[PDB]
Structures are given as structure tokens and as C-alpha cells.
């Protein structure tokens, strides 16, 4: 039950800065060494950052050095990447890794730092109304990546696909969350799908009835 | 500079695969501190081996690591569906820093066949009050990972307001895709019909909606 919680990243403009989080638990943060790993889409994996368990010793990779730091929190359990003057080079999903001895168990599930020039767009929600029947939710036009769609608050996971976002002519993304459900839950059972696009903290939560 | 890697690799169903990992003699050649790692689409990296040859509780013994010169090897027995995924190689290198493997794609061939389910929606009300106009096509559980999607109004052709996405693998190990075409209100209204064609292997299934 090791476990790394990893938060912020989002859009930033070319230039600019964001500071990455990794949150630890389940083990001693100390007595192990941290990475950071980041995977542009859709490449491969690269090493970009390596802290010791007391943050004396920091290594980066030359690709980043002069514009991302490394650090580490003893006493709050975090891990840290702090980076400045971002490209569009850097748009990546950001991984932080637990070391155990030159190898790497357990990483974060990571996090997306998109760096480009384009404005960010919450998606409009709407409803796709219908043994076993289909209903989803589309989500239209929004940027950047990532949405979350979740169904009566968590409460429905059985059934559910979630679809990758199609990347419009436009620029901008939509996906569409479809759940099959018991067709005699229809007209008792309400559902609701939840969205989540947090690079514009949109919300939305749309029922979907027959 | 990188640790170089096969960019795919391909075998059948029961059969053994070998990764090769070559480097330098400033890391494999020189350290036991290589690791493999396996990573799914859309999921973060998983470790398999380290040290290697050594296994992590929990990696199967299919999995296993070896080492000569400056190039490591990943073998991959009795080659599963759950196989098919990325597979990295990691070093220490000299200047107590890490280096990653470009990367292999592990395809395993002799699957089953799969007809793609299709799920087709018309534009919701919303949507038309909106001024806007969308059908979704969902398509799932097909293999092997490619598909054809055509769009019908009545029973012509649309080759404008469409967008397709490629080919993902699920979490049943199938493929889904979708397809979304872009209409304005009065189009959806003015045709009697509109279908979408999914065509795959050489089966074609085909999805209808009408304004209802």
C-alpha cells in the first residue's frame, strides 16, 4: 500500500513555469530515492530528474538541467519538481518513481504538463439518452487534456466505458462516456455522469434520462 | 547515447519473445543495475525485472532477465494477451544518472478474431438548441485493431464533419474507437436517415438514427 499521489500540471504558456507535486505514503519517504520520469506522446520514457533520500545528491538529465529542480520534503513526504522556461518540448505526462536500489517499484499514476500557445476551453456536456440499455455522456470541445467522467458520483463503475478524446480540426478535444445499464432501472434508477476538466475547474454533472 | 531497442517485436500466442537492450560500457557493460519495466497504454510503468535477472513478487516467471557485453535482454515466455504492451529497459549510467531504453512494442498475433459493437447516437435535444448538431458512433470489442468508419445521410456519402479516432485496446483486451460527425441542425432534420458503417476484417455492421 505504497502509494504516490501526484498533483498539478495543466496548460502553460512557452516560457512560463509549473511546479510539479508527489505525494507519499505506505512507506518511509525517506530511506529511498525519488525520480522524475516524464513520456511525451506517445514516445518513450526518459529519465529527467534523480534526488538521494536526503536530497544532498541531485542529478538531472541535460535535456532539463538550468530549468527544472529537484526537490524533496522529509517531514511532509513530498516530492518536487519545480520547472522554468518550459517549451513546447517538455509537453509530457510527468511521472515521480520510488527508488529501491538502481531499480524503480511503484510510480505515480502522472500527471500532464501540456506547454503551448493555445487558450484553455472548458467541454460542453450533453446528454446521449437511450435487458441491458445504452446511455452516455458526450464531452465537446475542450482543451487540453485530461476529463474525468465519472457516473452518480462513483457510485456506478459497472459498465461504464469511458472513450478516448478524438483531437477536432480545431484543436480541441471530445470524448464520449457511454454505461450499459438494466433497462428495468430505467425510469427508477437515476443517472448522472460527472465532469471533470480541471485545467478550467469545469464541473458539470448532467442527467441522462430516456 | 540511449539504450537501443527493437521498436516492435511480434510473436504468437504460447510462443517466447527476447528484447534486446544494448548500451554502453559506461552502464550495462559496467553496472547490475538494469531494470525493466512494462507499461500498458494509458497506465504508468510497471517494474518486472531488476538487478537483471531479479523478479519483484507479483511478476510471473514467464519474465525473464540476462545480461552480456553492454546489451541486456528481456525474454518473454508463453506469450499472453496481457503481454501486449510496452516494454523499457533502465540503466545506471556513470555519471550517477539514469537512462532509459527507446522502447519495444510486444504484439502477440494468433488472437481470436472480434466483431466490433456498435453503438450509434443521434444529436441530443441540447445540443440543437445549441445551434449544433452531433452524431457518435461507438465502436468496441474488435480485434485485431483496425476498423473503417463511413457515414451515410439517407444513403449517400459524407466525407465533411468527420472525425475518427485511432484504434485503442480496452481493458478486455479488445479495441475501441469512435467517431463523431459534425452537422448542423437542418441537415440532421432534412434527410430522412443518417447510418454509420463500421467495417471490419470484411463484415460491415451498420448503425442507424433518424429525428425522431
Known amino acids: 500500500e505504497v502509494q504516490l499521489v501526484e498533483s498539478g500540471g495543466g496548460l502553460v504558456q512557452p516560457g512560463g513555469s509549473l511546479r510539479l507535486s508527489c505525494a507519499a505514503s505506505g512507506f518511509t519517504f525517506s530511506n529511498s530515492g525519488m525520480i522524475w520520469v516524464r513520456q511525451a506522446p506517445g514516445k518513450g520514457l526518459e529519465w529527467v530528474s534523480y534526488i538521494s533520500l536526503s536530497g544532498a545528491n541531485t542529478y538531472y538529465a541535460d535535456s532539463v538541467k538550468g530549468r527544472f529542480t529537484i526537490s524533496r520534503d522529509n517531514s511532509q513526504n513530498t516530492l518536487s519538481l519545480q520547472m522554468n522556461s518550459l517549451r513546447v518540448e517538455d509537453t509530457a505526462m510527468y511521472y515521480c518513481?520510488?527508488?529501491?536500489?538502481?531499480?524503480?517499484?511503484?510510480w505515480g499514476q502522472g500527471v500532464l504538463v501540456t506547454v503551448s500557445g493555445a487558450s484553455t476551453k472548458g467541454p460542453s456536456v450533453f446528454p446521449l439518452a437511450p435487458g441491458t440499455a445504452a446511455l452516455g455522456c458526450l464531452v465537446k470541445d475542450y482543451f487540453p487534456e485530461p476529463v474525468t467522467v465519472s457516473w452518480n458520483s462513483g457510485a456506478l463503475t459497472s459498465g461504464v466505458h469511458t472513450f478516448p478524446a478524438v483531437l477536432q480540426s480545431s484543436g480541441l478535444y471530445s470524448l464520449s462516456s457511454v454505461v450499459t445499464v438494466p433497462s428495468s432501472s430505467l425510469g427508477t434508477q437515476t443517472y448522472i455522469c460527472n465532469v471533470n476538466h480541471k485545467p478550467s475547474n469545469t464541473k458539470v454533472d448532467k442527467r441522462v434520462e430516456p | 547515447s540511449a539504450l537501443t531497442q527493437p521498436p516492435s517485436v511480434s510473436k504468437s500466442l504460447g510462443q517466447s519473445v527476447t528484447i534486446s537492450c544494448t548500451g554502453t560500457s559506461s552502464d550495462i557493460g559496467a553496472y547490475t543495475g538494469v531494470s525493466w519495466y512494462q507499461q500498458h497504454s494509458g497506465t504508468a510503468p510497471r517494474l518486472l525485472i531488476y538487478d537483471v535477472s531479479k523478479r519483484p513478487s507479483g511478476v510471473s516467471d514467464r519474465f525473464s532477465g540476462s545480461k552480456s557485453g553492454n546489451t541486456a535482454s528481456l525474454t518473454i515466455s508463453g506469450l499472453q494477451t496481457d503481454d501486449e504492451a510496452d516494454y523499457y529497459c533502465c540503466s545506471y549510467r556513470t555519471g550517477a544518472t539514469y537512462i532509459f531504453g527507446t522502447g519495444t512494442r510486444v504484439t502477440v498475433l494468433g488472437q481470436p478474431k472480434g466483431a466490433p459493437s456498435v453503438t450509434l447516437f443521434p444529436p441530443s435535444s441540447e445540443e440543437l438548441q445549441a445551434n449544433k448538431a452531433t452524431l457518435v458512433c461507438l465502436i468496441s470489442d474488435f480485434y485485431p485493431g483496425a476498423v473503417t468508419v463511413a457515414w451515410k445521410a439517407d444513403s449517400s456519402p459524407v466525407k465533411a464533419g468527420v472525425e475518427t479516432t485511432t484504434p485503442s485496446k480496452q481493458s478486455n483486451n479488445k479495441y475501441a474507437a469512435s467517431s463523431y460527425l459534425s452537422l448542423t441542425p437542418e441537415q440532421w432534420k432534412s434527410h430522412r436517415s443518417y447510418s454509420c458503417q463500421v467495417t471490419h476484417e470484411g463484415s460491415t455492421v451498420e448503425k442507424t438514427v433518424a429525428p425522431t
Open positions: 518513481a520510488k527508488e529501491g536500489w538502481s531499480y524503480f517499484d511503484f
